[PDB]
Design a binder for this molecule. Structure first.
Ligand code: MET
Length: 519
């Protein structure tokens, strides 16, 4: 089905200021978004803020400000952070938005009409910080900020409290068999694979019904009212998860403001998400509750949920981007960690990767193929006959787009970067063997062949890196003199798409692409 590629970040709680966790989650969302745009697809990338609930209201009360003022302020800090980080997200949703609330009520009403919401009790543990219901097996003894002996979440270590409320209850237990069918029928729907296995084990163990409302006093009245029962408010997670549906139904203008909410999601061709990006801490909500809601409502299910190794919720990313470069930082975060949390975030290692990979591997190579010394005519030369060594490198360059594409689609952005850099290392090796600096005098016919391959290797690697390094890719292409039309589209993944005779861009006397730093 030709649709709009719909990729989401989670919507972030506004109890605290934006931080690296949020920036990472939204970076992954953004990169996926960018890759599909580079592929020539229609894209709708979504991010935003999760503004209702007990936690946000209590954080606003601690600041001695009204929940409305506080959410608006913090949402502003989030918006500004994401502008600073130079993302290309299509819309920023807020759960306080009136159109969002409409969609929630509409969804609630469907679930109710379907017979899947009933009036019952929740008597059990709850983590206000996680906004999560927990069984007694998921808690242990612990300490709080008054040093007192309390109970805490095994998940997150935050304080838990016993709740005993009459609550609207969603019949999650009825969806165990259908969820298991879904997981088994769609074995790539949860990535990475060990998290897919974790979800399945949990659903196999059995599912309780889920409390989807709370008494309004418990939430300090800071929530969406239940349709036809103002004594109750809608659970912040049903509220929150529904942002993805709301987002898929908003017409947005050129400045990024929502102008209209369509009735039927099919009108905008976004729903359901192709990729939900989340942290590992909210997997249950996205892989169990969310599909169960959609199943109840007869709505289509997402294609993939990708759960990274970090938590959704010092090291300030805007500070480090100003210190080391924006694209460089993004590169580092995406390169340094896969789905394991174990990975070394340190000035030592940021500099190791900056110098080793960005400067010495990529940057070095860009300068070699464009310098006046080696590229004497300042153009893409026409190649002479290819040796078997030439062919071996060409093969790597030809194969790379297909390999990188599979990685980007999993999605595993670390592996995609690695694949591209393997080819970059190969090109450096090739350039070392051929010694094109010697060939300017010794054999100019041979240099044409060597230079051309080098240029084309640089173009193709750069094109596949352009979702990771959106600014630097533009600079590289300007130096190489790659016309705008050749900077995107699957057609331009092909070897040879830029014809010989293309002139390089002008240089400037101070130009480095990535400046190395002191160790
Ligand atoms: C529907 S995604 C909700 C994410 C949640 N607000 C968090 O900050 O973890």
């Amino acid at each position: 089905v030709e649709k709009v590629f719909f990729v989401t970040s989670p919507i972030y709680y506004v109890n605290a200021a934006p931080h690296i966790g949020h920036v990472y989650s939204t970076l992954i969302t953004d990169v996926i978004g960018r890759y599909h745009r580079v592929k020539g697809e229609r894209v709708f990338a979504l991010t935003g803020t999760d503004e209702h609930g007990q936690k946000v209201a209590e954080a606003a009360k601690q600041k001695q400000v009204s929940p409305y003022d506080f959410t608006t302020a913090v949402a502003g800090e989030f918006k500004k952070c994401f502008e600073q980080m130079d993302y290309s997200i299509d819309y920023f949703i807020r759960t306080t938005n009136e159109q969002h609330k409409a969609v929630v009520k509409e969804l609630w009403t469907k679930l109710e009409q379907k017979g899947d919401i009933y009036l019952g009790r929740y008597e059990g543990w709850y983590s206000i910080s996680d906004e999560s219901f927990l069984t007694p097996q998921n808690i242990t003894d612990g300490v709080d900020k008054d040093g007192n002996p309390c109970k805490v979440s095994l998940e997150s270590g935050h304080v838990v409290t016993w709740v005993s409320e009459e609550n609207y209850m969603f019949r999650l237990s009825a969806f165990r068999e259908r969820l298991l069918e879904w997981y088994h029928a769609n074995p790539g729907c949860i990535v990475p694979e060990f998290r897919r296995r974790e979800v399945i084990r949990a659903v196999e163990k059995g599912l309780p019904d889920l409390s989807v409302s709370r008494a309004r006093a418990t939430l300090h009245n800071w929530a969406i009212p239940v349709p036809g029962n103002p004594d109750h408010c809608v659970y912040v997670w049903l509220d929150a998860l529904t942002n993805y549906l709301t987002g898929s139904r908003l017409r947005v203008d050129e400045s990024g403001k929502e102008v209209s909410l369509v009735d039927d999601f099919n009108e905008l061709e976004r729903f359901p998400a192709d990729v939900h990006v989340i942290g590992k801490d909210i997997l249950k909500f996205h892989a169990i509750y969310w599909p169960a809601f959609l199943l109840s409502a007869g709505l289509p299910l997402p294609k993939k949920i990708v759960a990274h190794g970090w938590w959704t919720k010092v090291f300030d990313p805007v500070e480090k981007a100003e210190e080391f470069g924006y694209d460089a930082l993004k590169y580092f975060l995406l390169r340094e960690s896969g789905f394991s949390d174990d990975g070394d975030y340190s000035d030592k290692n940021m500099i190791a990767r900056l110098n080793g990979e960005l400067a010495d591997t990529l940057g070095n190579l860009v300068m070699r193929c464009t310098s006046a010394k080696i590229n004497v005519n300042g153009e893409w030369p026409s190649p002479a006959a290819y040796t078997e060594e030439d062919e071996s490198l060409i093969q790597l360059i030809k194969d790379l787009p297909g390999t990188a594409d599979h990685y980007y689609l999993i999605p595993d952005i670390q592996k995609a970067i690695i694949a591209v850099f393997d080819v970059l290392r190969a090109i450096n090796a090739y350039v070392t063997d051929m010694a094109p600096w010697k060939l300017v005098k010794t054999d100019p016919e041979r240099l044409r062949t060597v230079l051309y391959i080098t240029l084309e290797g640089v173009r193709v690697t750069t094109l596949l890196l352009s979702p990771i390094l959106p600014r630097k890719s533009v600079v590289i292409f300007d130096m190489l003199g790659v016309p705008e039309v050749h900077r995107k589209g699957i057609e331009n993944f092909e070897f040879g798409a830029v014809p010989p005779g293309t002139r390089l861009g002008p240089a400037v006397e101070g130009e480095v692409l990535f400046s190395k730093r002191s160790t």
